[PDB]
């Protein structure tokens, strides 16, 4: 487009970013697929642990803090889940950390009780990993999924 009126329209009206929900039924059209779903089931598994080095590296590799999302001009991290015998973070903490670095700081963390596609039976006795729990912006239970 060749003049500022058309610019303004392409950036504010026909731009991708708004068009998350379809006007047909008002449901999502954008999401991740394939590798990214398989990856999520694995990264957010209870069996998933990361050392300080790995945890910090996953964070920085995906945040891109050198962007318009200077929600802070310093990356924030959580304390580890396991303190002793060895400092370890879980996968679910990587998610909490991501949200923590890209949601507004002057605003409380998201609260969600949801479910995913995988029945508890698949993880073992007593599992609750089918239940997706976000409390104050932290993923406290459940894996993340196509759902």
């Amino acid at each position: 487009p060749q003049n500022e009126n058309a610019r303004a329209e392409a950036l504010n009206l026909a731009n991708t970013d708004s068009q998350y929900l379809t006007p047909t039924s008002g449901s999502p059209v954008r999401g991740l697929i394939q590798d990214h779903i398989s990856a999520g089931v694995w990264l957010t598994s209870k069996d998933s642990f990361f050392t300080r080095e790995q945890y910090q590296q996953y964070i920085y590799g995906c945040i891109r803090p050198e962007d318009g999302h200077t929600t802070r001009s310093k990356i924030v991290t959580l304390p580890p889940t396991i303190f002793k015998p060895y400092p370890l973070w879980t996968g679910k903490q990587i998610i909490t950390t991501v949200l923590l670095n890209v949601t507004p700081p002057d605003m409380p963390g998201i609260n969600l009780i949801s479910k995913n596609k995988i029945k508890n039976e698949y993880w073992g006795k007593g599992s609750l990993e089918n239940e997706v729990l976000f409390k104050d912006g932290a993923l406290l239970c459940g894996i993340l999924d196509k759902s």
Partner: peptide
């Protein structure tokens, strides 16, 4: 009482 490895191999559920 019980140490169940479930389907994992680094984590176990303890009762």
């Amino acid at each position: 009482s019980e140490v169940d490895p479930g389907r994992y191999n680094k984590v176990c559920r303890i009762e």
